[PDB]
Amino acid sequence: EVKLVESGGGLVQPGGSLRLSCATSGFTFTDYYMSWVRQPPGKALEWLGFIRNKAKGYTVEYSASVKGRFTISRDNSQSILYLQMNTLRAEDSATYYCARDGYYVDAMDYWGQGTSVTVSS
Amino acid sequence: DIVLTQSPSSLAVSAGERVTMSCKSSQSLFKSRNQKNYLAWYQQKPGQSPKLLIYWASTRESGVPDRFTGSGSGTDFTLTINGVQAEDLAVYYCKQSYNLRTFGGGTKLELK
Numbered sequence: 001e002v003k004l005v006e007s008g009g010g011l012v013q014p015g016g017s018l019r020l021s022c023a024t025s026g027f028t029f030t031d032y033y034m035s036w037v038r039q040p041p042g043k044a045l046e047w048l049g050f051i052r053n054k055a056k057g058y059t060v061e062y063s064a065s066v067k068g069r070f071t072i073s074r075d076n077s078q079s080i081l082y083l084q085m086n087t088l089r090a091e092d093s094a095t096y097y098c099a100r101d102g103y104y105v106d107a108m109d110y111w112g113q114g115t116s117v118t119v120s121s
Numbered sequence: 122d123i124v125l126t127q128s129p130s131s132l133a134v135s136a137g138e139r140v141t142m143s144c145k146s147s148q149s150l151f152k153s154r155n156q157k158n159y160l161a162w163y164q165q166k167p168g169q170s171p172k173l174l175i176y177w178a179s180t181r182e183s184g185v186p187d188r189f190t191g192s193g194s195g196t197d198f199t200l201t202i203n204g205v206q207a208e209d210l211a212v213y214y215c216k217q218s219y220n221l222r223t224f225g226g227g228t229k230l231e232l233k
């Protein structure tokens with residue numbers, strides 16, 4: 001059974017930092033990519049980037065929207081995905097979904113329940 | 122900077138009916154190598170996490186009911202739901218995975 005559990009959500013103030021976590025299971029972690037998609041309350045989904053798998057070299061990619069500020073890393077041993085965020089701008093706020101990606105179906109076939117981020121002064 | 126425009130923005134319908142919705146692309150999403158259209162449709166019920174419905178334009182994901190049918194290629198794609206059930210109420214996103222990933226604005230489905 002595939003499981004993706006995100007965590008580390010809550011109130012923060014802009015410019016600060018926040019570390020989002022995403023535990024996995026039920027599949028060979030290193031066999032797949034791992035993407036981060038976010039959805040601002042009342043808005044559409046946004047792909048932030050992924051981290052490739054073992055065969056590719058666990059290299060990372062980012063959308064122009066978050067490139068530089070956010071950085072993605074993984075922990076193959078424990079099979080845990082991470083999103084290191086920097087300068088939590090007012091439009092950074094939203095529910096953050098980690099997902100299972102790759103070049104097999106070229107899609108995110110498994111998603112987590114997400115973790116909410118709210119930026120309040 | 123691939124841009125995916127979905128039409129319409131929203132659409133309400135009664136259960137059991139047949140609906141279509143459009144996904145329009147900026148660049149061709151067709152790969153001449155494996156001859157695959159790098160586009161996927163995603164279902165997201167209100168307050169829940171998104172779910173893969175279809176990939177490679179027409180390939181239905183495992184478990185997804187037969188009434189969900191995806192079609193099109195290049196820049197033009199559509200999602201067809203033959204006999205909309207109550208469970209179907211949700212926002213539908215098309216996504217290009219031709220170069221990294223990009224989601225459309227989404228098409229919201231209502232059931233009255």
Ligand SMILES: O=C(O)[C@@]1(O)C[C@@H](O)[C@@H](O)[C@@H]([C@H](O)CO)O1
Nearest residue numbers: 052061102103106218219220221
């Ligand atoms: O970024 C990748 O490594 C990846 O292989 C992801 C695939 O889904 C696919 O988009 C691919 C491009 O099509 C280039 O081959 O890039």
